[PDB]
Amino acid sequence: GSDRTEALKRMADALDNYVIRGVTHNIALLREVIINSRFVKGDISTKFLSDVYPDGFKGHMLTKSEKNQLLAIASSLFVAFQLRAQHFQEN
């Protein structure tokens, strides 16, 4: 991108639109590191990951608003399948 924020935002978007299924991949780790406040500011050392994840990688941690968005999306998608299940060709 033209600047540091544009390239990072575009990377975040590419990772969420990148479909890998059949194996276990490391997208969750890449998606969280690039959005880390130290990475965006640039306070990165060669041992960065060892201090951020001293007990291992745990996955993306949700905040209050993100949990509400995840619950709303999962609930709306659940209903969308329940409604599709009722649309038959008329007998």
Binding site: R84, A85, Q86, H87, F88, Q89, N91
Partner: protein, 507 residues
């Protein structure tokens, strides 16, 4: 006391059934009541209860004690809808006389059986019974006979589904044998004629209630139950999903539902599934999941006769049945157990106008005295018969092996098939190169040199295709597109057959 007060008092008792203390025990044991199960199964508010005020008329052994009367007489019957589609249900209530069958009990079930046949709607039974009600004696035996007569009459007319939600003993254990699918609940449901008490008393054998007739036995070893589910809530959730596959009656075409999965997409993942080396197995399920709409597949008997895969799926919205081999198990060979499961599935789908898709990869039959003495010949004829007599669209794709008589058993084109596709890895022959060449050139010199020439000419799908056995040889990635095209033009197919009172299956 007014009549309205008496009516209200009967309504309250009918809802409690066997009483609150029994209901409390029902939950302690990890089971739902008969009415709670229906509320989960059917669309909210759609259920209408029939004959809620019927009571027994039996007076032997002090059964005429008013304290021995219960409205509903151990069954909840009525009608409703699942996703807007009409279905009839009944559920046996274990808290009233142990769920035992009375004369009036059967009568109510028969009533539902008759309305469903007349209109053309499926019947779903939730069975849980301790057997015949001995206090009435022979009245309950007539009850069973009348139910059996309806279950036979309804065969091929309306789907019949039986979900077992608890123990089942005596004559009751035969109704799931007449219906089309039997499902169970793990560690809760049982199927057996006599209990362990009789086995110990008759013969010197030691067995418990789970070993004799538990859900794990019937879904893994005897081949009686089509699938067991972990608990009551999950069992009914999967039952609603299963229901959505089937037509309401055999007079109806396979249901077609809204579908977002483009019918003309390719599946590149198929081109490399089948190894070039003949001794390397692969998972047939990977092919099935990639072809079917949105990768949804409903597998039947996942733990029984694993060498053959049968189940339900949709393609372009239309329900289809899928049958195929599993090369991972017993090299993909046919045996007694696989023929029984296959023939039963094929026949149901034909009766209710559900197209068949066949994925062939079968090297022959399972050899050995275990199968010879078991009647492998008599049993293999069941699957050949089920395909040969089918009148619904049949689309066969051969993914790799098809040796010997198994070629024709697995729905070959000459059994009135509609289309037959081969992948480039398919090989159709009476037997493999080793057997065929050593027999043809028996006692000759330089057999291995002759084998090299034989393999180059015959170890491929071409000597069959050039004779009209195969309609095309397709890149595997296009399999879904080809099948979708055939299904949407064979759906209007009609054929005639000579009249016969009934079919005569080899048994």
């Amino acid at each position: 006391t007014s009549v309205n007060e008496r009516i209200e008092n009967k309504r309250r008792t009918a809802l409690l059934g066997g009483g609150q203390r029994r209901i409390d025990a029902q939950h302690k044991r990890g089971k739902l009541t008969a009415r709670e199960r229906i509320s989960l199964l059917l669309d909210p508010g759609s259920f209408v209860e029939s004959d809620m005020f019927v009571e027994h008329r039996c007076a032997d052994f002090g059964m005429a004690a008013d304290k021995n009367k219960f409205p509903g007489d151990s069954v909840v019957t009525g009608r409703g809808r699942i996703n807007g589609r009409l279905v009839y249900v009944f559920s046996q209530d274990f808290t009233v006389f142990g769920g035992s069958l009375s004369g009036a009990h059967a009568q109510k079930i028969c009533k539902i059986m008759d309305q469903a046949i007349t209109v053309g709607a499926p019947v779903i039974g939730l069975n849980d019974s301790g057997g015949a009600r001995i206090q009435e004696g022979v009245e309950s035996l007539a009850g069973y006979a009348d139910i059996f007569l309806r279950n036979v009459t309804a065969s091929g007319v309306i789907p019949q589904i039986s979900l077992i939600m608890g123990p089942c003993a005596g004559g009751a254990v035969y109704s799931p044998a007449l219906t089309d699918f039997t499902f169970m609940v793990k560690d809760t449901s049982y199927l057996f004629i006599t209990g362990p008490d009789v086995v110990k008393s008759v013969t010197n054998e030691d067995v418990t209630q789970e070993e004799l007739g538990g859900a794990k036995t019937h879904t893994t070893m005897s081949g009686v139950a089509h699938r067991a589910f972990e608990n009551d809530v999950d069992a009914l959730c999967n039952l609603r999903d299963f229901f959505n596959y089937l037509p309401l009656s055999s007079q109806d075409p396979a249901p077609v539902r809204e579908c977002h999965d483009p019918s003309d997409r390719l599946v590149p993942e198929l081109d490399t599934i089948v190894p070039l080396e003949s001794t390397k197995a692969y998972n047939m399920v990977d092919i099935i999941h990639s072809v079917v709409d949105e990768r949804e597949f409903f597998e039947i008997m996942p733990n029984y006769a694993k060498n053959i895969i049968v189940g339900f799926a949709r393609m372009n919205g239309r329900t289809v049945g899928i049958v195929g081999n599993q090369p991972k198990v017993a090299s993909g060979c046919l045996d007694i157990n696989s023929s029984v499961k296959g023939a039963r599935f094929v026949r149901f789908c034909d009766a209710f106008n559900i197209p068949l898709i066949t994925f062939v990869d079968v090297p022959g039959f399972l050899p050995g005295t275990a199968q010879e003495y078991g009647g492998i010949i008599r049993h293999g004829a069941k699957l050949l018969y089920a395909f040969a007599e089918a009148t619904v669209p049949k689309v066969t794709v051969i993914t790799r092996k098809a040796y010997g008589g198994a070629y024709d058993v697995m729905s070959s084109k000459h059994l009135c098939g509609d289309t037959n596709y081969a992948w480039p890895t398919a090989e159709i022959a009476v037997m493999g190169a080793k057997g065929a060449v050593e027999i043809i050139f028996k006692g000759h010199e330089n057999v291995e040199a002759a084998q090299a020439e034989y393999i180059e000419k015959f170890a491929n799908p071409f000597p069959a295709a050039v004779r009209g056995f195969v309609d095309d040889i397709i890149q595997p990635s296009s399999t879904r597109a080809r099948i979708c095209c055939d299904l949407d033009v064979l759906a209007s197919k009609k054929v005639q057959r000579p009249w016969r009172k009934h079919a005569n299956i080899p048994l």
